[PDB]
Amino acid sequence: KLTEEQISEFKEAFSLFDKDGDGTITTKELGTVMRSLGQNPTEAELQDMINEIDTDGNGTIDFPEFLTLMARKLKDTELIEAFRVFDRDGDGYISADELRHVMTNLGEKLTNEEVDEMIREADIDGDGQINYEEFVKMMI
Amino acid sequence: KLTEEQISEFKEAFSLFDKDGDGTITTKELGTVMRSLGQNPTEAELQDMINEIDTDGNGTIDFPEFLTLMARKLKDELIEAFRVFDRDGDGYISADELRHVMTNLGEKLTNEEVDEMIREADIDGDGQINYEEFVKMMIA
Amino acid sequence: DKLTEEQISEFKEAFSLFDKDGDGTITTKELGTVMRSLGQNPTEAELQDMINEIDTDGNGTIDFPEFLTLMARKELIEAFRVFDRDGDGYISADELRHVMTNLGEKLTNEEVDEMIREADIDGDGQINYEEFVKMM
Ligand SMILES: [Ca+2]
Ligand SMILES: [Ca+2]
Ligand SMILES: [Ca+2]
Ligand SMILES: [Ca+2]
Ligand SMILES: [Ca+2]
Ligand SMILES: [Ca+2]
Ligand SMILES: [Ca+2]
Ligand SMILES: [Ca+2]
Ligand SMILES: [Ca+2]
Ligand SMILES: [Ca+2]
Ligand SMILES: [Ca+2]
Ligand SMILES: [Ca+2]
């Protein structure tokens, strides 16, 4: 039962990868996103990833091909690496500016209060920062 | 009497380890590189390796620390690495096998450059690198 | 009461962790090397201030008697943070062993495990801030 909010989330996800917004994700854009989260896939590995879901033989990911990538590679059940990515100064917490820096690096423009609202939504213990438990919760 | 070519070789070597190119080698990058050559060092073993040469107490390898690592651990084991290179196990390393090893190591080389590497290391002129030629190549 | 030769030897070993060329004096450069091996990045002026405080005769370096005088004297949450490298709030066996190796006292896993177990109060296998302060 597809609904509009689901599609909006899919499109936000796709925008996180399609940096120039030209409708397809290239190997460069995919590799950039994977680098921003602490990984170094090679040109050949990225071409392999895209080739497994490419349907029109152009070496780039369009929207349905991206949804298929999600279906194939995402699973319910590595996390500490992502937390460390967000946790810039290594104090065990993700501050508002650290979240803002990650968001910005992903091409997302959020105002100060918007980042604070994200933090507040995910901040259970109310200390003003995101720890590992809260990060895992907001990621699943 | 350090020379420009030697510094270029030191930096090529360091680039083989500093995958993200941020100036220092982490335990993650060192472990990835060592796994690419058929070894499974543990987190603690990698931390120990870096600790024996660490001069600024951050658990990562910078350039002088990397040169010191070379001076300490290089000596005047090879069969495992050769087997790693020899993908199809026929006792020879072809151009595509060498090219894949190069790619996996984050090295971007054109086709003719790989052929020139073969030409340099292929003594008996058969167009592939056997074990003797592989060992001799890892000295010059 | 006179010191034993083993006492003097241990004092000289601790001094030699700073006086690394073994010429009997600790310069600002050598103290900086130590502090950097610990992860800190003190400026030359901070190092000079440390020296000045400890250099009672004013010749610009620390010698063995001045070092001993400092030893007779004993926040420290920064010293703890220096040992706790991953910042999880505890000092692990690997962390203590690595710190000591960088300082110049290479210890074995066995020795460090035993040493931490002897200083371990709550018995969780790691030295927390309170145990660190209590030992100090
Ligand atoms: Ca694009
Ligand atoms: Ca496509
Ligand atoms: Ca943080
Ligand atoms: Ca929180
Ligand atoms: Ca690096
Ligand atoms: Ca280092
Ligand atoms: Ca082969
Ligand atoms: Ca040959
Ligand atoms: Ca000295
Ligand atoms: Ca003096
Ligand atoms: Ca720790
Ligand atoms: Ca304890």
Author numbering:
A (entry chain B): 3 to 79, 84 to 146
B (entry chain A): 3 to 78, 84 to 147
C (entry chain C): 2 to 75, 84 to 145
Question: What does the study report here?
Answer:
Calmodulin (CaM) is a Ca2+ sensor protein found in all eukaryotic cells that regulates a large number of target proteins in a Ca2+ concentration-dependent manner. The protein consists of two homologous domains (also called the N-terminal and C-terminal lobes), containing two Ca2+-binding EF-hand structures each, connected by a flexible central linker. One of the several proteins that induce helical conversion in melittin upon complex formation is CaM, which binds melittin in the presence of Ca2+ with a Kd in the low nanomolar range (∼3–60 nM) and forms a complex with 1:1 stoichiometry.
The asymmetric unit of the hCaM–melittin complex contains a single entity while that of the pfCaM–melittin complexes contains four. The relative orientation of the two lobes can be characterized with the virtual dihedral angle defined by the four Ca2+ ions because the inner structure of the two Ca2+-binding lobes and thus the position of the 2 to 2 Ca2+ ions within them remain identical in different complexes. This dihedral angle is very similar in the pfCaM/A and hCaM complexes (118.0° and 117.5°, respectively), while it differs significantly for pfCaM/C, where it is 125.5°. In the pfCaM/A complex, two residues form contacts with each hydrophobic pocket; Ile2 and Leu6 interact with the N-terminal hydrophobic pocket, while Leu13 and Leu16 forms hydrophobic contacts with the C-terminal hydrophobic pocket. Based on the anchoring residues, this complex can be classified as a 1-5-12-15 type complex. In contrast, in the pfCaM/C complex, Leu6 and Leu16 could be identified as N-terminal and C-terminal anchoring residues, respectively. Analysis of the secondary structure of the peptide in the complexes with DSSP showed that in the hCaM–melittin complex and in complex pfCaM/A two helical segments of melittin are intersected with a short turn in its so called kink region, while in melittin in the pfCaM/C binding mode even this segment remains part of the bent helical structure. It contacts the exterior of the C-terminal hydrophobic pocket in pfCaM/C, while it is more solvent accessible for binding mode pfCaM/A and in the hCaM–melittin complex.
